[PDB]
Ligand binder design. Structure first.
Ligand SMILES: *[C@H](CCCCC)[C@H](O)C/C=C\C/C=C\C/C=C/CCCC(=O)O
Ligand SMILES: *[C@H](CCCCC)[C@H](O)C/C=C\C/C=C\C/C=C\CCCC(=O)O
Lengths: 297, 297
């Protein structure tokens, strides 16, 4: 039973990686692009980009461990542990050439360590809508003159006593609509059906727990990245960020300038956090153009 | 019916103030001291301090509007609105002499405007464990490298669509144990029996909602205080803050110096947010000594 509709010409499949059965959706022909989703979502957030990219690339969109239909990690939820699974998954399909990487929200957290540690394996990189875990996150204000901030969920999700699982269980659909819309500029892209699908997915008890275990490991990821960041990223990089409500604005490119030698960035006016859905057409175009001056079918 | 045991020699009573029935506990003889509790608790947090103060003062400990056994406010939950109720209640019992004030957590928010607008009515002032609402609160971090953000609850409680009531209803006792203990250094004083008492009270639907409405009005209170703070406090003031997990440390005194000409502050080591319970002996001593520098019975 697929949690989300698979687009035509794609297959929903599973691979075992280090004892963890990972789910992904794959299609297309050419060099590999891996698309890594973020919190609240699954591979499905890429379902509009995937058929376009599949015209020139092999496209794979895994579910993060514990989310969607992927088994939880057996090592842990820090960025360095999770990135092992995603790197080895990508290499099962592109063992002989570098692959491209596109990540959104905690997809960044779960890929940056494998990018920095295996730079020869990464052809081009696209990061959108999340800080790389480092000391900058310790500055983000808890509360704003307009009300709730964009980052208080860090502490809510990281709290112990299974605080988030316990308060959200039985209200998963309600809470998902709230945080989607509280980080959105364009809420009308989110149908009741789409919200139902996302909510059913992360409401699985192991997926609800997995969602927050990424945040309970966030400080460990920050400490890990403090060492990894001694090595600057050398591949061509693009950042994308929303310019509207929920968007990260200039922070995305400005942070990446400290990590990457070769980086260009865009801020999308009128768009919030959920770029693949709120601003599908211009985000698809920027990603496709950026990846298509590298190499492709 | 009493939500909490009234100490020997005190009366539990009610008084209508501008159409709102406020509950209070009162005892002793001499000049008046009003003790104003904060979020998650009621008049009862003062129940160990009250018999000692009552040897020298008339002591009144009201329930904040909507909390404990007091009716919700009819005007609103901003600091300036709620302070009217508390000032009028005090002045019912001390119409012709200044009175003393002790306030904890959001009891500060709900008293600071009537202090600065009626400085001749306040003989001495003791504030503990809360910022006065102003622009400084917009810089407190959402997420910390160590420990936990003390202030992320600001956005949780202020989030719209009744987010906090919807998630917490039916789980009030679990949530109260979590946020009390996470803001505590000496957690062992919060026995299940004591947590049961506090949770039964704020689980009343109108009390659970009232609790969060104080935070939904926080931005308004900040705007109110920007004008009010053009006049510094002139009466003798003392600040207390915990030095341990959950405590505000030096911030309490350092902010108060911007508001008061005559202020001394204490940081209590090994004590978190809940000073009357975690550190009863040194806190009671500090308060009694400070208020007994003035006229007492
Ligand atoms: C995923 C967010 C999911 C939203 C639902 C809970 C990650 O947990 C967070 C990624 C992005 C969140 C948005 C804001 C990041 C904060 C940066 C603000 C920078 C300010 C600036 O422009 O300088
Ligand atoms: C009552 C909170 C206690 C109940 C827990 C849910 C008020 O809402 C908050 C009062 C006291 C603690 C919060 C603020 C800390 C004040 C200054 C922060 C100094 C340093 C920093 O953390 O930024």
């Amino acid at each position: 039973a697929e949690e989300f509709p698979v687009p035509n010409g794609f297959e929903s499949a599973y691979r075992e990686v280090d004892g963890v059965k990972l789910h992904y959706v794959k299609g297309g022909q050419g060099p590999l692009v891996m698309l890594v989703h973020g919190f609240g979502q699954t591979w499905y957030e890429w379902h509009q980009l995937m058929p376009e990219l599949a015209k020139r690339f092999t496209v794979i969109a895994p579910d993060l461990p514990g989310l969607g239909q992927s088994e939880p990690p057996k090592t842990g939820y820090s960025g360095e542990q999770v990135a092992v699974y995603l790197h080895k998954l990508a290499r099962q399909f592109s063992p002989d050439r570098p692959f491209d990487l596109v990540a959104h929200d905690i997809g960044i957290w779960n890929t940056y360590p494998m990018v920095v540690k295996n730079q020869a394996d990464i052809a081009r990189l696209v990061y959108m809508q999340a800080p790389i875990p480092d000391a900058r996150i310790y500055r983000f204000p808890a509360f704003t003159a307009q009300g709730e901030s964009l980052v208080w969920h860090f502490s809510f999700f990281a709290a112990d006593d299974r605080l988030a699982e316990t308060l959200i269980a039985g209200k998963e659909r309600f809470f998902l609509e709230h945080f989607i819309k509280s980080h959105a500029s364009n809420t009308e892209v989110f149908s009741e059906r789409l919200l139902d699908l996302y909510a059913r997915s992360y409401a699985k008890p192991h997926s609800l727990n997995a969602s927050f275990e990424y945040y309970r490991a966030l400080n460990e990821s920050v400490r890990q990245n403090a060492e990894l960041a001694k090595t600057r990223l050398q591949m061509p990089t693009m950042t994308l960020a929303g310019g509207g409500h929920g968007g990260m604005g200039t922070f995305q490119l400005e942070q990446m300038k400290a990590y990457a030698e070769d980086v260009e960035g865009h801020v999308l006016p009128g768009c919030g956090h959920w770029l693949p859905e709120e601003c599908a057409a211009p985000m698809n175009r920027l990603v496709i153009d950026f990846l298509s001056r590298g190499r492709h079918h």
